[PDB]
Design a protein around this ligand. Structure first.
Ligand SMILES: Cc1cc(SC2=C(O)C[C@@](CCc3ccc(O)cc3)(C3CCCC3)OC2=O)c(C(C)(C)C)cc1N
Length: 563
């Protein structure tokens, strides 16, 4: 059927949308080529609409059914529980979209009677009615990127489809526990969101080393959300229902699937009807879990079709990477063509053709790749990294304009061991925090789609617990990694190592002179910038964080917040 049908009504904005990086003394010290940085707006929504709108064709086969049966078996061992209205309310992000029924996120988190009355009513209606399509709002995402000359053009805004706040809270009550525990049980080691960056690296390196002639490849589905059929979404629901659930959770899940996950009318911000969706809703609680289950299922069936030898997968939503035994270059190319044909029949056709890689550092999955460096002792240390272009463009934008979510903070946490996060992100942002005397100010940032409120002063313990003390001492980065970063710096017009080290030494001196937590930041985060290094012993505050739950499941588009 058609993934979308349109009435002609436009996907409209709610407020002014900036498309170009504003000229600003602070972002300019980060990078000078501001014209290279842009933010998508609803102006390009039509472009994205044309691309995501197409007819799906899907044929299933024994390999698909066998894998599905095995997935259901694993699911049958999971017991999940309903979330109380209060537990659900606590997960709502402080600035989540407000309801159209006279109440917003502040109200829900406060448990105002009006918010709760409405939550009860929606829940009650989900139980009584399992058929009326639930309304959804469609908006054009406003994300920042850097121009890609090699691509020929810029990216259009991605689209986000989500239900009313009241429905979102009910989604948490019925499915939060399921989407939190089911995926790892059904997909085992292949479930990507269970790993911290360090653990992902460990899994990837051990897997690669376990093959005799290792070959790896990532599979890019053209518009995965749009390729998800009603069949896929119903198959997902049957896997959820395999869990031991409370009668009410079962009905609510059946209802959300029929009335919302399967499809529904699209309404723009002007209140007009834009059309109808028959594919995955990008902004619901089950988007991450569903996407990973479906990608996993089709890919596993596809590995069998292509007869890949001793393959191992790693899936994160629509992101997929397979590592297997190589059978030769011509044979590997052939194997990948069959694999792609299988995925296409399953309604998961490719964007870029998959291509065989024989070097682990060159395989990019989840926009990342493993790389190597050496800690203080000189020993080799594998770590996760990525091309720093989008992180830096976004850091520039967030410096010039106030952002709800601070991707720069999330990036420092996830890519703490990288030379670019240390040289540029830490130095640039601590300088500004020093300037504004905002080191204590908690900021929102996201990790695996969930929102976290984190205090910059706690970065040393977070990074130590997350990456270990080595993150504060890596040096001798790979020539490839260094080339990639230098290339990016000249493309965006970012200052060089000499300038950043000089800046870091100033920032470090100020931090140290302030004492307290600030001093520890100057000491650990900027030890690289001084000739006479201090010695980084284990920070005692590390052992006490509650860093669990951080790498348990994905929640992109799921409206999740964590205290
Ligand atoms: C501590 C240490 C550092 C070094 S050099 C060095 C780096 O290798 C890493 C790093 C520089 C990485 C870098 C390299 C090239 C660039 O264009 C931009 C950045 C990073 C570290 C954090 C920000 C920049 O900091 C450094 O000073 C060396 C060499 C033998 C390689 C000279 C030995 C030891 N023991």
């Amino acid at each position: 059927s058609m993934s979308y049908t349109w009435t002609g009504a436009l996907i409209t904005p709610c407020a002014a949308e900036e498309s170009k990086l504003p000229i600003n003394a602070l972002s300019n010290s980060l990078l000078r080529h501001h014209n290279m940085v842009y933010a998508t707006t609803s102006r390009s929504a039509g472009q994205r609409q044309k691309k995501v709108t197409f007819d799906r064709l899907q044929v299933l086969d024994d390999h698909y059914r066998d894998v599905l049966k095995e997935m259901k078996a694993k699911a049958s061992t999971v017991k999940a529980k309903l979330l109380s209205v209060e537990e659900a309310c606590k997960l709502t992000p402080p600035h989540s979209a407000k309801s159209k029924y006279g109440y917003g996120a502040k109200d829900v988190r406060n448990l105002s009677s009006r918010a709760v009355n409405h939550i009860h009513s929606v829940w009650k209606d989900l139980l009584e009615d399992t058929v009326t399509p639930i309304d959804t709002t469609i908006m054009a995402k406003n994300e920042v990127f850097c121009v890609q000359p090699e691509k020929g053009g810029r990216k259009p805004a991605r689209l986000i489809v989500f239900p009313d706040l009241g429905v979102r809270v009910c989604e948490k009550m019925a499915l939060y526990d399921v989407v939190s525990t089911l995926p790892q049980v059904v997909m085992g080691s292949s479930y990507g969101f269970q790993y911290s960056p360090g653990q992902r690296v460990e899994f990837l390196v051990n897997t690669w080393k376990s093959k005799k002639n290792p070959m790896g490849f990532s599979y890019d589905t053209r518009c995965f959300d749009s390729t998800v059929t009603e069949n896929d979404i119903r198959v997902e629901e049957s896997i959820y229902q395999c869990c031991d659930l409370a009668p009410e959770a079962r009905q609510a899940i059946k209802s959300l699937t029929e009335r919302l996950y399967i499809g529904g009318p699209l309404t723009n911000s002007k209140g007009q009807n834009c059309g109808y969706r028959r594919c995955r809703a990008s902004g619901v609680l089950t988007t991450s879990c569903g996407n990973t289950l479906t990608c996993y299922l089709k890919a596993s069936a596809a590995c069998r079709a292509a007869k890949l030898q001793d393959c191992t997968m790693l899936v994160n939503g629509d992101d997929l990477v397979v590592i297997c035994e190589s059978a030769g270059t011509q044979e590997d190319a052939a194997s990948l063509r069959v694999f792609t044909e299988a995925m296409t029949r399953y309604s998961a056709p490719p964007g870029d053709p998959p291509q065989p890689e024989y070097d682990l550092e060159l395989i990019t999955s989840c926009s990342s790749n493993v790389s190597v460096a050496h800690d203080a002792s000189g020993k080799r240390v594998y770590y996760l990294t990525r091309d720093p272009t989008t992180p830096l463009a976004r850091a520039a934008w967030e410096t010039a304009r106030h952002t709800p979510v601070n991707s720069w903070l999330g990036n420092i946490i996830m890519y703490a061991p990288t030379l670019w996060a240390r040289m540029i992100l830490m130095t640039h942002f601590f300088s500004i925090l020093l300037a504004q005397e905002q080191l204590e100010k908690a900021l929102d940032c996201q990790i695996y789609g969930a929102c976290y409120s984190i205090e910059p002063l706690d970065l040393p313990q977070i990074i130590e617990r997350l990456h270990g003390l080595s993150a504060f001492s890596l040096h001798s980065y790979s020539p490839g990694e260094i080339n990639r970063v230098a290339s990016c710096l000249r493309k965006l017009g970012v200052p060089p190592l000499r300038v950043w080290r000089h800046r870091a030494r100033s920032v470090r001196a100020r931090l140290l002179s302030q004492g307290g937590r600030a001093a520890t930041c100057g000491k650990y985060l900027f030890n690289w910038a001084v000739k006479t290094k201090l010695k980084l012993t284990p920070i005692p505050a590390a052992s006490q964080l509650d860093l669990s739950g951080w790498f348990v499941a994905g929640y992109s588009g799921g409206d999740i917040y964590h205290s």
